[PDB]
From Swiss-Prot:
Monomer. Interacts with bacteriophage T3 DNA polymerase. The gene is trxA. GO terms for biological process: cell redox homeostasis. It comes from Escherichia coli (strain K12). GO terms for molecular function: DNA polymerase processivity factor activity; protein-disulfide reductase activity. This is Thioredoxin 1.
Amino acid sequence: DKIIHLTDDSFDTDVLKADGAILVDFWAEWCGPCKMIAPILDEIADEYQGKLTVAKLNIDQNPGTAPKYGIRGIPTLLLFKNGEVAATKVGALSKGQLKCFLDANLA
């Protein structure tokens, strides 16, 4: 919905040159946990619309990004603040968990 689907080629423009925080989620279809935190990213996206942009990057279609940030497995969450990594979250999580992670890292 408000979620931006990324690619290795658009990552620079969409994430690094952006103004305002962006939460990047590295996912794939074969990753069960990813699919479960997906509907959660939908909720957060509309609820934090205005203070945060939620972006998804499918590592099967874009195998080049993850290795640039030392991402070993998925799911992985990277929160950016104008071109740089602010905080990282790994493994399955809940809406509450993500909201606490966002309250602790967003301005």
